[PDB]
Design a protein around this nucleic acid. Structure first.
Ligand SMILES: [Mg+2]
Ligand SMILES: [Zn+2]
Ligand SMILES: [Zn+2]
Lengths: 195, 82, 1139, 280, 153, 96, 49
DNA sequence: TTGTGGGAGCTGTCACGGATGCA
DNA sequence: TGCATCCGTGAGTCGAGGGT
RNA sequence: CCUCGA
């Protein structure tokens, strides 16, 4: 049965079938909160367990944490005032921001996620600019280059999720390929040429 | 017809952050708490938030219309200050 | 000017000295003619009449005259009355182009026709002029304005009508079966096929296969006449031996049983249906294209009458005999009249069987549909009314025609939002060739054979410029010198050769005609008179193969080496030194460069820049010679020689469809005399009339502390301080005050709970003030909405009850600045119902605010050369950190070495070397004679002044020997030092440590573009925001402040990690646990522990959908009972009351 | 630099000699003694040989400190085929159908292809991009099927204590005194737990059962003169629902024995699907 | 499988797949392929049902075939394709999300199937801790308390 | 209210008794809403009587718009004053 | 055997085969088949409606 | 509800398995 | 009652923006 | 749905 433009009408069965159906599109995978995306750039000054989070992105990601620490310290009268201050990007938040960022891991992902190394945990450090800084040694696992690639940031909230990030999924804890045991966080082309 | 993906049809509800700050109260929550007597505070808070009938607020505090309707008229003029 | 100056025909063109060694015997045609000629044919313009009389057919017929002649006369059942249409006419345009873009209108002109009504009964003639509708017009640039937006109609690649044979090899019996397809212009298809059982079967549109003899017996043929014409293959005989119908009457009966099944067949329904199905020009038509195809392939009626265009009995007999002979190894044939017809199968991808439907034909088909529906209405109204009252005005209902045109321009895949990043993008967009659409093939039928380069594409469709993603091979672009046929085929020009002498007579050929003759190459030696110099020349033969053939046997020659490439592709210097993938990437990324505040033509070009800029339309060109009378930033007025004046206004800081800035600047002064065809003003990405898509950057090829690692790019901070890579971006925000149930929305300055500071930049209306710098979240337009007495918050009910305010309870719905946006408000437009401004139903006021931002180059911004060398900026270094030359000059861009050799794009290095020479100029030593390497050089290249613009055409550019020679005689700097040796390298100092770098580094000047993938547009984040209604999951996309998709593969990765709690949190309290997300916000705001996950709402929705599918699905507890999954909401009330 | 891209100084003579050979094949075809398929096959042989020869001349003319040579031979990036395409000759180009064309691209990218050479090379380029698009989706579908069929396999116990396993070749005894090491050891015997003891003829057990069989254990087994070894795999695991850690063996990622909760099924599906994009 | 047996077809399949992957320069350890091969040979075909409720010619897990036999019957080893083995899974919810949702749901309704909700994919769908990694009862239920020597200090 | 610890999830064919037990009413009209007032038509595909009220604690005919009446059924329009959330969990039915 | 599959599935369970024919059709709640007001008098619905 | 009046638009897809349907 | 045919499966992931 | 990015 066709509607306007000879287009078949989506039936009750279509809702379940296909990649667009409920199973593939809403149950085996979903859109999540406390998450962002940006273009990656190489940061060689980074350590294997570190990554560069743009300041605006980190502020939005950690917004309620920043508000709570902004009311703990007397910068904010109440929580609505803290919300208004974080929204207006007031100068006081940034000192607070780096405080709530310390040792709170984030998850970096680059699609297509071919193996589990396609998602790795990093410690974020605030970076000036709007680009994520990615360690040059994790590019083999992500199959990442800097021809325009983008990556996604997910923020674990629960204590168990933070623990799984710091222990299981931490960048510096997964150096070897889970497929062949060979090193992936290995010196690549430029570093090779140099050595 | 809708767009090809039905999941891009937005719900028109307030967000968790939006429903948190909207359910609480501003800084005047300490004006109606301490500056007013508990006779005005309890009668004004239950006649405007809950919207009970004038005889239902008469039943909660064991007071007639003469007490409930008065504590409301005077609690509003009390809270008109500040 | 000398011959080495490219684009000498264009007056006032910059003097770009070209390395070319071959003469240009034909100029690039109008690059927009693929659009304008099509539309002018549709109209019937005088510009089209002159061309149709000069070199077209002797009889001119317009696109609308054709539909009218096909439509008139309209008659009734008794033939008692007739109505004919004639003389399509257009009035003036309703509004200018800018007024149409402003008011969200459609640039159109009214259409009129002469509707003559004759009455065979009362003997009268009733002519009349009838208004047909508002026909959308094509602008000068070849575009359309629809509902306020600019659009391009892309030509479609479709199967030409005709007869096409295909053989299919089968595993079973190993026999090669054969099938025939008859594709008409209108009407349903018929098909022929020999089965596995050697049974020749004929198929109708959607019907079971019937014996071919049934069709002869459906045409009344005798059983002996079939044996006289066929049976030489014996397959026809054995098909007639198979049990089939008996006689022609039962044949028509059973064939009328096939069509319209389930209906009681008769003996007259067959006579009525078979006549109109394939033999009546009212329901079946293969146009002059299809008639020509079937007549040339089958040898039918070669005496060139084109009177009737409809499948005839002769055609069907010839086609069935063709199939019979093709099943056998018969390779030749004759018919009763057929003269030397080969017997082959047809290539569907060949450009002789694959034609183009341009914008004219695409619109003509929709007009034909609307006209047929109008004719149905006319015939239905003719019977009902009386002769005393009917008139050409009352019979005609124009609504279906208008509806068809509107629906075409608004819902067709071929009417596309114009790509307006820069002039080049739009220029190639109008020359695009799309394979998909209505009548073309489906996306699910786009096999690999459609997508790859066909040999017939040479000189017609470029083999390089094509999408890198899922549309690869489905979207081509017309070649430079290519041209579309009246039949719809693509022709390319070739120089004619007679007895080994290449003349200047140009002949345009179709792929069909090209496969007959012998076509040489443009790089072939020629005598001063025009004669070949080699004993044998390289030539292209029929199958697409190449060989060497003596000069006495060559027929045609390529007009230009550039003949096979498109415009964008022809703009890549040293294209021949690039691999096809990187060349494709460069062609695509040229169409993605943003316009900069200041244009700068490339030092190294190919000569296509001038013509591309001019034909793109975004440049202002003198329509007639004269003298400038006045020149302002606003307009340029020129006094002609006869006394008339012409004034050209300037698009100043205009937003494009993609937010880039179209800003034209006059390049003439008050006294200047300009020629017709000369560029008067420079639009976006143009410099003195040439396409200037990027900047000439000082580049050093070397690694640098791993900041340019893995395609990343390092930039000197000078590019920020001096704004050399700065661009302007304009965004349009809009809001509307409309009607609601509880009242009417209002645009006001008075918004509740808002300080006077955050409203300072608003006027009295509630609209931001022009010139205000708005930040992230600032109010652009204030707007309040009536609110119901149940939506009020607890703090709101108190303020409403204590004060007893008015019944107009309003919620703040003001238009605010989205995240990541900022700039100056440069324009405001407002529409109100108080004025005659038209608005949709129930919309009181409609206001648009235009915000402009100046984006300097930043980290994350994407740059690219013209050779597919793309990369993002990883680090902007201070001018003191950059490696600097011996004289103190710091390099501007550091490109990593490891990228160049493996990507197979070495032209980017050659461009660099030449880029240095042009920057410093040269002086070839000719005292002891002109050197040997410099022999082929034209005399204008033996010396060059600094910053010399230079053209290196593709396949005729600077040779390696000449380029190596130029690096030796590089003129020195101001101090007499030669900074770049003859290897193209130089000794740089490390501006950080101070010590010089140990080895020389290749430095030069490379053309770098700012691609429209800027980090300001990509960066996005979200803690919490709007959710989907149907599934309660976060919305998607940045524009909706949506969350990121955590897909199935990401969950696989999580599980492989064994991170169970992270996976549960991501899928419950971050997506659709409607209570868990609010409890999470509360816990984080109060430093409490994150709560326990709930039940995903999407799972509830799945259960409800299964129950809607009559599936009793139930959740069972540990004991066997059913678990009710519902909510009670007292907890919120308890907490809020205890608050 | 254009100077660093050296052109082999013997390219012209190599191509002339092989053009003579191709002309002999063309005259054998004009005679009628050669088949058209034979003509194409002979020409493909000739031009593959000529490509290899200009590549040899290229690598013999290049000094080993040349940057294009340093980049490839150090393992940094690229392969010598690209170097030969750049400085030497492109070689044979495929058809839209997949076959090779009798006439090759004799030009290098440093010299600049001709018009017809560029147009012919485009066929191969386009077909390669499209076929890569296809192979990505095929590999994705296979990976999804593997993930679904294998997501039951998770480790649930430390050791099912079964004595079953599979025998694996560690080496082969050549007629010489040398012991030809097996190529599959990196993927067959490495990172396995030992099933039964590996004892030499008249000697003590060199590796006890239950050992990780790492590089030290493999090298000790090889120096001991052992040529076969029985290992415990998940093919012979006696665990009811999942597999046991000892039968699975070492975790490739962590280098130690696999932990309990590890869902080695998904890890295996991903390890099989991830390099699928490279198959042809 | 029929002639030489299951522990031979396993070697055959592993070596063939490894040959294909090695012909292109791919180094995948054998255990990854073996984990996949194992899930093909998990079921048997019922030749003669006998005293059992199994229908003849049906594919039953070897665990059910070996445990259901309470003598108080005839099973032949089966090689199975990954799609076939996936669709024949323990959990109808798991199979509905893989392929052929309509057929799976119809046959689940007719057979009045009941999903025991044990398996990582099903837990993903319903929002429960997957039974693997940190979700198994060994690690997910741990008692943690400070010592007395540390409570004193 | 309930942590997702369910033993099994069972599926089977739905008898017409199941479809009637689920349903909160019978849809009888093709009309969807009133184009003028944006108010759902009665017995239609969006009927507030059977599916639920569009707005929280508000009945169709307006007699009850307050949380005090929570639980009652408006005798004029048949709408239950409750949360609009129920509008995504209350199924209707069509008698053939 | 093919027929016995379905016949025994209907037999052993106590599921009546009558369920394969319907006398009333379930209607999914409106929020899962949304109707939204578009710009102007236009409206948009899912195909289910 | 009287005197006539039957459609769009598609195929340019490929590989595989098993119920269906006819010889 | 023995297959050939026809019909019904499946065909990568994530992003941006614009439309009906 | 289209065009585009990796
Ligand atoms: Mg990339
Ligand atoms: Zn085991
Ligand atoms: Zn009511």
């Amino acid at each position: 049965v066709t509607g306007p433009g000879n287009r078949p009408l989506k039936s009750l069965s279509d809702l379940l079938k296909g990649k667009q159906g409920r199973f593939r599109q809403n149950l085996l995978g979903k859109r999540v909160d406390y998450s962002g995306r940006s273009v990656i750039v190489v940061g060689p000054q980074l350590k294997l367990h570190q990554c560069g989070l743009p300041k605006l992105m980190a502020l939005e990601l950690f917004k309620p944490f920043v508000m709570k620490r902004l009311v703990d310290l007397n910068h904010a009268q109440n929580i609505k005032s803290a919300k208004r201050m974080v929204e207006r990007q007031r100068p006081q938040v940034w000192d607070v921001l780096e405080e709530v960022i310390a040792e709170h891991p984030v998850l970096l992902n680059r699609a297509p996620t071919l193996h589990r190394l396609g998602i790795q945990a990093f410690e974020p450090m605030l970076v000036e600019g709007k680009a994520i800084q990615l360690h040059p040694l994790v590019c083999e696992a992500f199959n990442a280059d800097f021809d325009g690639d983008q990556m996604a940031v997910h923020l674990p909230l629960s204590a168990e999720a933070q623990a799984e990030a710091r222990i299981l999924m931490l960048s510096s804890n997964n150096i070897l390929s889970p497929a062949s045991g060979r090193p992936l966080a290995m010196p690549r082309l430029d570093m090779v040429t140099g050595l | 017809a809708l767009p090809e993906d039905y999941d891009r049809v937005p719900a028109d509800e307030p967000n968790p952050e939006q429903i948190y700050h909207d359910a609480r109260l501003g800084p005047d929550l300490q004006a109606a708490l301490q500056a007013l007597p508990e006779e005005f505070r309890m009668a004004v808070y239950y006649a405007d938030v809950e919207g009970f009938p004038y005889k239902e607020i008469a039943e909660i505090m064991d007071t007639p219309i003469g007490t409930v309707m008065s504590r409301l008229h005077r609690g509003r003029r009390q809270l008109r200050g500040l | 000017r000398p011959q080495s100056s490219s684009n000498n025909s264009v007056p006032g063109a910059p003097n770009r000295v070209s390395f070319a060694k071959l003469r240009e015997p034909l100029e690039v045609p109008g690059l927009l003619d693929v659009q304008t000629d099509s539309f002018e044919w549709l109209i019937g313009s005088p510009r089209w009449r002159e061309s149709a009389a000069e070199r077209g057919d002797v009889n001119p017929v317009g696109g609308l005259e054709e539909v009218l002649y096909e439509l008139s006369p309209i008659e009734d059942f008794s033939g008692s009355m007739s109505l004919s249409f004639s003389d399509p006419r257009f009035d003036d345009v309703k509004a200018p182009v800018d007024e149409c873009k402003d008011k969200d209108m459609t640039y159109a002109a009214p259409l009129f026709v002469t509707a003559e009504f004759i009455n065979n009964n009362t003997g009268e003639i009733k002519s009349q002029t009838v208004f047909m509708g508002d026909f959308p017009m094509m602008t000068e640039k070849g575009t359309f304005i629809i509902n306020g937006t600019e659009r391009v109609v892309v030509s479609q690649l479709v199967r030409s009508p005709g007869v096409y044979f295909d053989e299919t090899i089968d595993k079973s019996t190993d026999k090669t079966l054969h099938s025939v397809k008859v594709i008409p212009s209108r009407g349903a298809w018929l098909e022929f096929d020999v089965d596995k059982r050697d049974t020749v079967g004929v198929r109708i549109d959607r019907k079971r296969r019937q014996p071919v003899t049934v069709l002869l017996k459906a045409l009344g043929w005798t059983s002996e006449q079939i044996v006289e014409r066929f049976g030489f293959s014996e397959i026809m005989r054995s098909t007639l031996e198979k049990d089939n119908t008996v006689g022609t009457d039962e044949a028509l009966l059973d064939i009328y049983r096939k069509l319209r099944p389930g209906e009681p067949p008769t003996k007259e329904s067959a006579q009525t249906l078979l006549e109109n199905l394939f033999f009546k020009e009212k329901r079946y038509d293969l146009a002059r294209v299809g008639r020509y195809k079937v007549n040339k392939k089958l040898g039918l009626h070669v005496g060139e009458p084109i009177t009737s265009s409809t499948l005839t009995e002769e055609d069907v007999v010839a086609t069935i005999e063709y199939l019979v002979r093709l099943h056998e190894g018969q390779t030749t044939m004759t018919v009763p009249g057929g003269v030397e017809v080969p017997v082959e199968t047809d290539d569907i991808d060949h450009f002789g069987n694959r034609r183009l439907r341009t914008v004219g034909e695409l619109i003509q088909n929709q007009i034909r549909v609307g006209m047929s529906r109008m004719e149905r209405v006319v015939r239905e109204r003719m019977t009902t009314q009386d002769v005393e009252a009917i008139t050409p005005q009352t019979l005609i209902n124009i609504r279906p025609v208008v509806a068809a045109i509107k629906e075409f321009f608004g819902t067709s895949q071929l009417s596309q939002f114009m790509d307006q990043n820069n002039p080049l993008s739009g220029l190639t967009h109008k020359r695009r060739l799309s394979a998909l659409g209505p009548g073309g093939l489906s996306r699910e039928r786009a096999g690999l054979e459609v997508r790859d380069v066909h040999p017939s594409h040479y000189g017609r469709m470029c083999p390089i410029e094509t999408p890198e993603g899922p549309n690869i091979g489905l979207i081509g672009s017309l070649s430079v010198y290519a041209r579309v046929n009246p039949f719809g085929f693509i022709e390319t020009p070739y120089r004619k050769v007679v007895d080994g002498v290449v003349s200047d007579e140009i002949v345009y050929l179709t792929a069909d005609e090209e496969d007959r003759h012998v076509v040489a190459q443009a790089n072939s030696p020629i005598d001063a008179d025009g004669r070949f110099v080699e004993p044998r020349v390289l030539v292209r033969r029929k199958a697409g193969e190449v060989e060497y053939v003596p000069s006495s046997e060559v027929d045609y020659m390529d007009v230009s080496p550039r003949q096979m490439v498109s415009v964008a592709t022809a703009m890549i210097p040293f294209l021949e030194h690039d691999d096809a993938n990187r060349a494709l990437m460069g062609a695509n990324m040229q169409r993605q460069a943003v316009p900069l505040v200041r244009s700068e033509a490339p030092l190294v070009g190919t000569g296509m820049e001038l013509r591309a800029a001019i034909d793109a339309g975004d440049v202002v060109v003198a329509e007639e010679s004269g003298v400038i009378e006045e020149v302002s930033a606003d307009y340029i007025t020129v006094m002609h020689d006869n006394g008339t004046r012409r004034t050209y206004r300037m698009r100043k800081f205009a937003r494009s469809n993609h937010g880039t800035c179209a800003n034209q600047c006059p390049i003439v002064d008050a006294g200047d005399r300009v020629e017709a065809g000369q560029v008067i003003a420079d639009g976006p990405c143009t410099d003195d009339g040439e396409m200037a898509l990027g900047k000439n950057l000082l580049v050093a090829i070397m690694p640098w502390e791993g900041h340019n690692y893995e395609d990343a790019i390092i930039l000197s901070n000078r590019l920020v301080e001096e704004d050399v890579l700065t661009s302007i971006h304009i965004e349009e925000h809009e809001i509307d005050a409309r009607d609601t149930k509880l009242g009417a929305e209002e645009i006001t300055r008075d918004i509740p709970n808002i300080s006077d500071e955050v409203l300072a930049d608003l006027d009295e209306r509630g609209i931001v003030r022009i010139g205000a710098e708005v930040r992230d979240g600032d109010i652009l337009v204030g707007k309040v909405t009536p609110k119901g007495e149940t939506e009020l918050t607890p703090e709101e009910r108190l303020l409403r009850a204590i004060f007893g305010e008015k019944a107009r309870e309003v919620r703040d719905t003001s238009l605010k600045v989205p995240h990541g946006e900022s700039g100056k408000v440069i324009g405001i437009r407002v529409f109100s119902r108080e004025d005659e401004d038209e608005l949709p139903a129930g919309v009181n006021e409609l206001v648009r605010v235009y915000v402009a931002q100046k984006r300097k180059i930043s980290d994350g911004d994407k740059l690219a050369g013209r050779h597919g060398n793309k990369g993002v900026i990883g680090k902007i270094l201070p001018v003191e950190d950059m490696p600097f030359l011996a004289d103190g000059t710091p390099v501007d861009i550091i490109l990593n070495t490891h990228g160049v050799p493996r990507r197979m794009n070495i032209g980017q290095i050659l461009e660099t070397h030449l880029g240095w020479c042009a920057h410093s100029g040269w002086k070839v030593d000719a005292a002891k004679g002109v050197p040997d390497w410099a022999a082929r050089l034209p005399d204008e290249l033996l010396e060059a002044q600094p910053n010399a613009i230079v053209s290196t055409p593709v396949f005729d550019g600077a040779q390696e020997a000449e380029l190596q020679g130029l690096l030796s005689c590089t003129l020195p700097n101001r101090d007499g030092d030669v900074l770049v040796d003859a290897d193209g390298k130089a000794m740089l100092f490390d501006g950080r440590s101070g010590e010089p770098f140990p080895y020389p580094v290749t430095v030069g000047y490379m053309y770098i573009m700012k691609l429209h993938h800027l980090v300001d547009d990509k960066i996005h984040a979200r803690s919490t925001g709007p959710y989907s209604m149907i599934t309660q999951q976060p919305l998607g996309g940045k524009a909706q402040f949506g969350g990121q998709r955590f897909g199935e593969m990401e969950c696989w990765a999580m599980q492989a990690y064994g991170a169970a709690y992270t996976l549960q949190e991501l899928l419950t309290i971050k997506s659709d646990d409607t209570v868990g997300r609010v409890k999470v916000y509360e816990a984080i705001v109060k430093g409490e522990n994150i709560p326990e996950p709930g039940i995903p709402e999407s799972f509830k929705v799945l259960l409800k959908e299964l129950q809607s599918l009559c599936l009793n699905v139930e959740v069972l507890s540990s004991d066997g009972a059913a678990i009710e999954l519902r909510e009670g909401e007292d907890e919120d009330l308890e907490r809020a009351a205890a608050n | 630099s254009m100077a660093d891209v050296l052109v082999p100084p013997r390219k012209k003579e190599i191509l002339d000699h092989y053009e003579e050979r191709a002309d002999k094949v063309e005259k054998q075809f004009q005679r009628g003694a050669l088949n058209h398929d034979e003509r194409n096959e002979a020409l493909v042989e000739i031009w593959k040989e000529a490509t290899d020869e200009v590549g040899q001349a290229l690598r013999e003319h290049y000094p080993d400190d040349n940057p294009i040579i340093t980049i490839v031979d150090s393992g940094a990036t690229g392969n010598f085929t690209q170097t030969r395409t750049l400085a030497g000759m492109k070689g044979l180009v495929t058809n839209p159908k997949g076959e090779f064309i009798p006439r090759p691209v004799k030009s290098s990218f440093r010299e600049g292809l001709t018009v017809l050479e560029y147009f012919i090379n485009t066929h191969g380029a386009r077909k390669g991009l499209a076929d890569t698009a296809l192979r990505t989706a095929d590999s994705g579908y296979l990976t999804r099927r593997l993930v679904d069929v294998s997501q039951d396999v998770i480790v649930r116990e430390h050791d099912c204590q079964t004595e079953r396993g599979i025998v694996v070749e560690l080496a082969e005894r050549a007629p010489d005194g040398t012991l030809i090491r097996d190529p599959y050891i990196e993927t067959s015997a490495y990172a396995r737990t030992l099933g039964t003891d590996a004892v030499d003829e008249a000697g003590n057990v060199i590796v006890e059962r239950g050992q990780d069989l790492g590089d030290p254990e493999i090298d000790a087994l090889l120096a001991a003169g052992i040529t076969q070894v029985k290992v415990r795999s998940v093919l012979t695991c006696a665990t009811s629902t999942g597999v046991c850690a000892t039968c699975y063996g070492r975790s490739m990622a962590t280098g130690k024995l696999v932990d309990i909760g590890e869902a080695v099924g998904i890890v295996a599906a991903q390890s099989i699907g991830e390099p699928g994009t490279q198959l042809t | 499988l029929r002639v030489q047996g299951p522990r031979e077809v396993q070697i055959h399949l592993v070596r063939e797949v490894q040959e294909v992957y090695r012909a292109q320069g791919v180094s995948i350890h054998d255990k990854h392929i073996e984990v996949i091969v194992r899930q093909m040979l998990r079921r048997v075909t019922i030749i003669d049902s006998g005293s059992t409720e199994f229908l003849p010619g049906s594919l039953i897990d070897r665990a059910e075939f070996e445990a259901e036999n309470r003598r108080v019957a005839a099973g032949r080893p089966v090689l199975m394709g990954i799609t076939k083995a996936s669709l024949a899974t323990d959990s109808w919810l798991s199979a509905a999300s893989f392929q052929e949702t309509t057929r799976v749901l119809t046959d689940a309704a007719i057979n009045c199937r009941s999903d025991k909700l044990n398996g990582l994919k099903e837990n993903v769908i319903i929002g429960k801790l997957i039974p693997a990694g940190t979700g198994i009862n060994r690690y997910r239920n741990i008692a943690v308390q400070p010592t007395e020597e540390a409570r004193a200090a | 209210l309930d942590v997702n610890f369910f033993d099994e999830l069972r599926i089977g064919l739905a008898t017409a008794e199941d479809i009637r037990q689920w349903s909160y009413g019978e849809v009888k009209k093709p009309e969807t809403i009133n184009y003028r007032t944006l108010k759902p038509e009665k017995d239609g595909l969006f009927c507030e009587k059977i599916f639920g009220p569009t707005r929280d604690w508000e009945c169709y005919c307006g007699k009850y718009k307050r949380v005090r009446f929570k639980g009652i059924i408006c005798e004029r329009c048949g709408v239950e004053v409750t949360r609009a959330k129920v509008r995504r969990e209350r199924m209707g039915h069509i008698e053939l | 055997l093919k027929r016995l599959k379905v016949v025994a599935a209907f037999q052993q369970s106590g599921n009546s085969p009558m369920g394969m024919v319907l006398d009333a059709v379930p209607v999914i709640p409106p929020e899962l088949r949304p109707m939204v007001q578009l710009d102007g008098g236009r409206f948009a619905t899912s195909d289910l409606n």
